Write a protein that binds this ligand. Sequence first.
Ligand SMILES: C[C@@H]1C[C@H]2[C@@H]3CCC4=CC(=O)C=C[C@]4(C)[C@@]3(F)[C@@H](O)C[C@]2(C)[C@@]1(O)C(=O)CO
Lengths: 12, 249
Amino acid sequence: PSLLKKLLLAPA
Amino acid sequence: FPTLISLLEVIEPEVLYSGYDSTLPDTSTRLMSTLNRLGGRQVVSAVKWAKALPGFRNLHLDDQMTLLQYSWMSLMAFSLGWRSYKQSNGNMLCFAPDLVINEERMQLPYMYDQCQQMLKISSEFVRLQVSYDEYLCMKVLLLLSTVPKDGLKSQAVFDEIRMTYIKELGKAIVKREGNSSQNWQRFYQLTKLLDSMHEMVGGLLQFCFYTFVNKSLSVEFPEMLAEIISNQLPKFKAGSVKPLLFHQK
Ligand SMILES: C[C@@H]1C[C@H]2[C@@H]3CCC4=CC(=O)C=C[C@]4(C)[C@@]3(F)[C@@H](O)C[C@]2(C)[C@@]1(O)C(=O)CO
């Protein structure tokens, strides 16, 4: 998983 | 009671510092690498902003990724334009509170041409005397203005969101003036500016693509930005992306 995907999936 | 425009004001991220080290040799390579480091951190902010943007997370995750990967440079250059407008009236490039580039610091290899391209974006804000709320609505529409020629996975959701923020730009225009007499003229001017951003940013993107692929220049990119460019670049060079234009262009 890319860093962008991880950030989009992170709760916030 | 709460309006979409008031929410856009509240979610707009705070401006980042660069942490630039002035003791080092002013060289084009060092400057480009410092700017890319700042750019990677601004892109992280922009992703957090998009998550908070009403409607955006209703898109399929692959569409959220596509829109951010395709539009990141438009978003960054538009906001650099706004900062340079508000802080210097378009005379200097106001990258960060601790990184302001004036005309003579621009006199650097490769740098001068790209720097003039960035100032032209700021000069359009001066010409049109863009308001903060018009800027925020336009910035949303840049996130939503470059798509695959083959379409998106949640196309119906996308079309709904995009139409919602086109309507919101109209509301920002009415809020600005008071004589509604110029409301259509204003909407025409600002949508022409949106359409023109594709060309104004295209040269920045080509230069970025060159400095990314040509490892000889020794320009550094941070990890998330490199990942984004590596996905964006082949789609852009192949002609598989299209801009969503308001006017016959
Ligand atoms: C001319 C291009 C366009 C530049 C970008 C213009 C938009 C921008 C605004 C900022 O406030 C921070 C960084 C960025 C996002 C940027 F300034 C850097 O990343 C460096 C950049 C890509 C560039 O200078 C390079 O390709 C150097 O490698």
